[PDB]
């Protein structure tokens with residue numbers, strides 16, 4: 121028997137080899153599958169609906185401020201922090217980001233001239249993609265991160281894009297009468313404490329002609345909070361704080377149609393996400409020395425730097441096991457297209 | 462190689478034994494499972510959404526008049542023609558009908574004093590159940606069958622029920638400003654050519670306080686029209702005419718929330734339906750001589766009587782194979798509770 125702190129100690133000291141690390145995390149996700157799958161569809165739906173109902177009761181009641189230079193050394197060219205799309209075995213992370221952006225544009229039915237809102241826009245890859253491809257679109261990113269807003273505005277300037285603005289806001293607190301032809305939510309809904317109210321708020325920012333496109337990490341069958349099942353799981357709470365991230369089932373959002381109506385529904389197989397986190401892990405490993413140097417003035421000590429790096433690297437190692445599980449057929453990416461009620 | 466007419470000939474002459482009959486029908490449903498299941502959830506959703514979209518394009522464009530005495534000889538006490546619920550191995554069809562009625566009342570949140578509409582009420586078992594149990598409810602059955610209306614009214618009279626009325630109407634053509642606290646649709650939606658318009662129509666018969674409860678035969682994973690895949694399937698078109706019956710997936714109705722909003726969702730394992738059709742088959746077999754005598758004056762010849770009997774018996778034999786497939790975990794019954802938008 122070994123404690124959390126024992127495994128955590130070895131992890132932070134780089135004493136767990138990649139083989140053992142992957143094995144340990146795969147086992148943790150294996151136990152999540154045992155927890156989530158029920159013997160009958162009757163029981164599966166009972167379990168799933170209990171989860172959905174609990175989310176609706178949450179109506180009653182991560183640090184994205186890392187330096188841009190570090191994020192540039194770990195992620196692809198546009199610093200996309202979401203599942204990318206890989207056509208080939210030799211597809212690069214840069215190509216995969218672009219392919220994913222194109223996929224979103226196709227599925228969200230983006231057309232030149234539209235007003236576009238990207239909720240939780242991150243480093244703005246999708247915002248910049250749409251702004252460059254569709255010069256008559258006006259594209260607004262919304263983020264709660266000052267660093268992210270500043271990065272996007274700088275990039276828009278460098279790219280001679282005049283059709284970009286960024287709203288600095290907590291989306292759950294943002295009040296506006298403004299409406300948009302297209303609202304995009306790419307791997308942001310997983311952070312939403314109150315989904316029913318979130319979807320309601322989004323619907324008020326839509327007209328009859330608007331479409332809403334949501335992309336979220338999912339499991340194909342069941343939903344779960346990204347948290348430890350038992351005391352043996354050192355991994356989940358290390359990656360995300362308690363209550364930060366919800367992994368909805370691929371169909372969970374179908375039960376959140378009070379204010380929006382589904383038009384289409386897709387999933388993207390988990391191997392795409394697996395290849396995404398693998399590319400990030402490999403790039404971080406290649407740029408390890410550089411990353412360490414970038415992080416040192418902002419953090420204080422080499423130990424605090426090692427801590428941030430281990431966190432991100434383990435996220436990628438763990439993510440690989442999660443999304444590659446059964447060749448991408450467990451955890452994957454769900455996508456949904458909605459119109460307003 | 463053997464033709465449809467060859468198998469059909471032997472079936473109508475009672476030359477196919479129960480063992481071979483079950484085996485043949487099981488194989489037909491086996492091929493439906495091969496048709497419906499896709500290798501990845503990505504492909505599964507593509508397939509499922511194509512089906513859902515095709516149903517929404519059907520916005521552009523069985524004989525329930527058999528004698529009551531015959532139906533009494535084949536079905537349970539209230540002549541329920543839908544999946545029943547069996548607690549025990551020794552549960553009778555009469556007990557299973559009552560248990561199913563109770564299940565609907567619980568899940569549809571029936572309370573004394575409500576106005577209740579039962580759409581496609583059949584021989585009115587559920588209508589009579591609610592009327593007797595809840596004396597302050599006013600219960601309306603709606604059916605397109607004169608025989609069914611007449612049977613219900615007679616039963617209500619015999620049972621001293623003063624809170625029952627029956628609307629004789631094609632539900633798709635029925636126009637009314639009347640609203641109801643509860644609308645129940647028990648294995649009727651499978652007959653609906655236009656589901657989106659059906660759900661829309663139902664919503665106009667609801668107020669803000671109303672609930673809609675739908676029960677339908679389903680497959681847990683995919684939808685299909687109840688029809689022959691290939692030329693080898695003699696069974697499907699014999700049971701139902703082309704375009705009569707749609708088997709929605711257990712989740713298909715989640716995509717039909719334009720005008721109603723989901724509140725709860727259940728499935729009942731297929732063994733309950735299997736036990737239902739088994740009980741009907743066994744009762745028909747026990748009352749075979751009587752059934753033949755009942756049907757003779759209304760039909761004309763012993764051959765025409767044998768035809769109706771073979772149709773109903775094969776429905777039960779086939780239904781057993783369909784619903785018992787993988788211990789009830791393929792085809793089953795889906796149930797959904799909705800409020801108005």
Ligand SMILES: Nc1ncnc2c1ncn2[C@@H]1O[C@H](CSCC[C@H](N)C(=O)O)[C@@H](O)[C@H]1O
Pocket residue numbers: 184199200201202239240241242243244245262263264265268289290291292305306307308311
């Ligand atoms: N309450 C909130 N309000 C606004 N933004 C939020 C938020 N909670 C999380 N976010 C943002 O949502 C993002 C999720 S990461 C996804 C980023 C981007 N859509 C991409 O695909 O790369 C983070 O960048 C975070 O800043």
Ligand SMILES: Nc1ncnc2c1ncn2[C@@H]1O[C@H](CSCC[C@H](N)C(=O)O)[C@@H](O)[C@H]1O
Pocket residue numbers: 525540541542543580581582583584585586603604605606609630631632633646647648649652
């Ligand atoms: N367009 C339509 N309008 C009204 N009733 C219809 C209809 N199409 C089918 N039906 C009725 O719907 C019923 C389906 S059978 C289910 C009967 C009953 N709900 C029970 O559980 O036993 C049939 O009795 C048929 O008469």
Ligand SMILES: C[N@@+]12CCc3cc4c(cc3[C@@H]1Cc1ccc3c(c1C2)OCO3)OCO4
Pocket residue numbers: 201202203307308310311337346365439442
């Ligand atoms: C957007 N997401 C929000 C929720 C979430 C949750 C996840 C996940 C990825 C995501 C995504 C993608 C992503 C990629 C890189 C990141 C990251 C996230 C968080 O946070 C820091 O670095 O893999 C397992 O569980």
Ligand SMILES: C[N@@+]12CCc3cc4c(cc3[C@@H]1Cc1ccc3c(c1C2)OCO3)OCO4
Pocket residue numbers: 542543544648649651652678687706780783
């Ligand atoms: C109501 N349903 C409508 C659609 C449908 C479709 C079915 C099924 C049962 C039914 C039900 C249940 C039933 C039971 C007995 C019947 C019957 C039906 C038809 O028609 C004549 O006798 O089993 C396989 O496919």
